[PDB]
Design a protein around this motif. Structure first.
Motif, PDB file in Angstrom:
ATOM      1  N   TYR B  34     -18.788  -1.203   0.039  1.00  0.00           N
ATOM      2  CA  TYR B  34     -17.613  -1.235   0.147  1.00  0.00           C
ATOM      3  C   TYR B  34     -16.992  -2.548  -0.025  1.00  0.00           C
ATOM      4  CZ  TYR B  34     -18.038   3.554   2.476  1.00  0.00           C
ATOM      5  OH  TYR B  34     -18.219   4.866   2.550  1.00  0.00           O
ATOM      6  N   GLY B  35     -15.499  -2.428  -0.494  1.00  0.00           N
ATOM      7  CA  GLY B  35     -14.724  -3.543  -0.537  1.00  0.00           C
ATOM      8  C   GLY B  35     -13.726  -3.560   0.602  1.00  0.00           C
ATOM      9  N   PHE B  36     -13.605  -4.378   1.448  1.00  0.00           N
ATOM     10  CA  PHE B  36     -12.610  -4.184   2.386  1.00  0.00           C
ATOM     11  C   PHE B  36     -11.713  -5.473   2.556  1.00  0.00           C
ATOM     12  CE2 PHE B  36     -15.931  -1.593   4.833  1.00  0.00           C
ATOM     13  CZ  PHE B  36     -15.369  -0.452   4.489  1.00  0.00           C
ATOM     14  N   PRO B  38      -7.280  -6.572   3.334  1.00  0.00           N
ATOM     15  CA  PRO B  38      -6.096  -6.173   3.940  1.00  0.00           C
ATOM     16  C   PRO B  38      -5.315  -5.533   2.735  1.00  0.00           C
ATOM     17  CG  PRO B  38      -6.203  -8.660   4.000  1.00  0.00           C
ATOM     18  CD  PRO B  38      -7.480  -7.917   3.716  1.00  0.00           C
ATOM     19  N   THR B  39      -5.139  -6.107   1.310  1.00  0.00           N
ATOM     20  CA  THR B  39      -4.402  -5.725   0.473  1.00  0.00           C
ATOM     21  C   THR B  39      -4.506  -4.188  -0.100  1.00  0.00           C
ATOM     22  OG1 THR B  39      -5.581  -7.136  -0.987  1.00  0.00           O
ATOM     23  CG2 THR B  39      -3.646  -8.057  -0.020  1.00  0.00           C
ATOM     24  N   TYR B  40      -5.529  -3.802   0.360  1.00  0.00           N
ATOM     25  CA  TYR B  40      -6.079  -2.575  -0.458  1.00  0.00           C
ATOM     26  C   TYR B  40      -5.174  -1.343  -0.119  1.00  0.00           C
ATOM     27  CZ  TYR B  40     -10.629  -3.817  -2.103  1.00  0.00           C
ATOM     28  OH  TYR B  40     -11.447  -4.434  -3.040  1.00  0.00           O
ATOM     29  N   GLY B  41      -4.763  -0.446  -1.199  1.00  0.00           N
ATOM     30  CA  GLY B  41      -3.921   0.534  -1.129  1.00  0.00           C
ATOM     31  C   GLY B  41      -4.306   1.771  -0.063  1.00  0.00           C
ATOM     32  N   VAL B  42      -3.621   2.646  -0.262  1.00  0.00           N
ATOM     33  CA  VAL B  42      -3.716   3.927   0.472  1.00  0.00           C
ATOM     34  C   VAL B  42      -5.208   4.355   0.533  1.00  0.00           C
ATOM     35  CG1 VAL B  42      -2.737   6.305   0.990  1.00  0.00           C
ATOM     36  CG2 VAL B  42      -1.193   4.349   0.357  1.00  0.00           C
ATOM     37  N   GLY B  43      -5.561   4.721   1.496  1.00  0.00           N
ATOM     38  CA  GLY B  43      -7.079   5.394   1.555  1.00  0.00           C
ATOM     39  C   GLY B  43      -8.198   4.392   1.679  1.00  0.00           C
ATOM     40  N   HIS B  44      -8.150   3.058   1.793  1.00  0.00           N
ATOM     41  CA  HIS B  44      -9.234   2.160   1.582  1.00  0.00           C
ATOM     42  C   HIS B  44      -9.448   1.455   2.704  1.00  0.00           C
ATOM     43  CE1 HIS B  44      -9.613   3.042  -2.826  1.00  0.00           C
ATOM     44  NE2 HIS B  44      -8.048   3.175  -2.787  1.00  0.00           N
ATOM     45  N   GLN B  45      -8.771   1.596   4.034  1.00  0.00           N
ATOM     46  CA  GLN B  45      -8.876   0.678   5.060  1.00  0.00           C
ATOM     47  C   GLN B  45     -10.364   1.052   5.756  1.00  0.00           C
ATOM     48  OE1 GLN B  45      -5.430   0.392   7.976  1.00  0.00           O
ATOM     49  NE2 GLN B  45      -4.303  -0.340   6.200  1.00  0.00           N
ATOM     50  N   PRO B  46     -11.038   0.199   6.450  1.00  0.00           N
ATOM     51  CA  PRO B  46     -12.214   0.405   7.005  1.00  0.00           C
ATOM     52  C   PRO B  46     -11.837   1.053   8.361  1.00  0.00           C
ATOM     53  CG  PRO B  46     -11.509  -2.057   7.107  1.00  0.00           C
ATOM     54  CD  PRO B  46     -11.001  -1.403   6.212  1.00  0.00           C
ATOM     55  N   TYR B  47     -12.577   1.802   8.775  1.00  0.00           N
ATOM     56  CA  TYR B  47     -12.509   2.620   9.813  1.00  0.00           C
ATOM     57  C   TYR B  47     -13.953   2.684  10.883  1.00  0.00           C
ATOM     58  CZ  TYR B  47      -7.614   4.104  10.072  1.00  0.00           C
ATOM     59  OH  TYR B  47      -6.146   4.208  10.181  1.00  0.00           O
ATOM     60  N   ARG B  48     -14.010   2.379  12.138  1.00  0.00           N
ATOM     61  CA  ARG B  48     -14.911   2.338  12.811  1.00  0.00           C
ATOM     62  C   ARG B  48     -15.303   4.000  13.450  1.00  0.00           C
ATOM     63  NH1 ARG B  48     -16.711  -2.966  16.333  1.00  0.00           N
ATOM     64  NH2 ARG B  48     -17.289  -4.136  14.480  1.00  0.00           N
TER      65      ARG B  48
END
Lengths: 49, 49
Positions: B34-36, B38-48
């Motif tokens: 994965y590439g995490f 903050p600038t990533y677009g919709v759908g790409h944020q990391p989640y625990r």
């Protein structure tokens, strides 16, 4: 209807006034073009189905 | 299967011959990083979870 193809391209005469082959009030083209840009994020990218 | 853990990394043998444990044509490692950012677009944020 299931498994039907709708390719008739007319300015959609939603209203009581004929669109006269041109855009106007209560006359919108039903066909819309997909905007697929390389900058567009995932979710709006072109997917083959 | 439900409630199963897969950790063994076998190079995908898309070809007729075994990849012999090395990367190459038609030989892809299943694990994808994965590439995490903050600038990533919709759908790409990391989640625990």
């Amino acid at each position: 209807k299931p498994f039907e193809r709708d390719i008739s391209t007319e300015i959609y005469q939603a209203g009581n006034k004929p669109c006269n082959g041109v855009a106007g009030p209560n006359c919108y083209s039903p066909l819309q073009s997909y905007g697929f840009r390389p900058t567009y994020g995932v979710g709006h990218q072109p997917y083959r189905v």
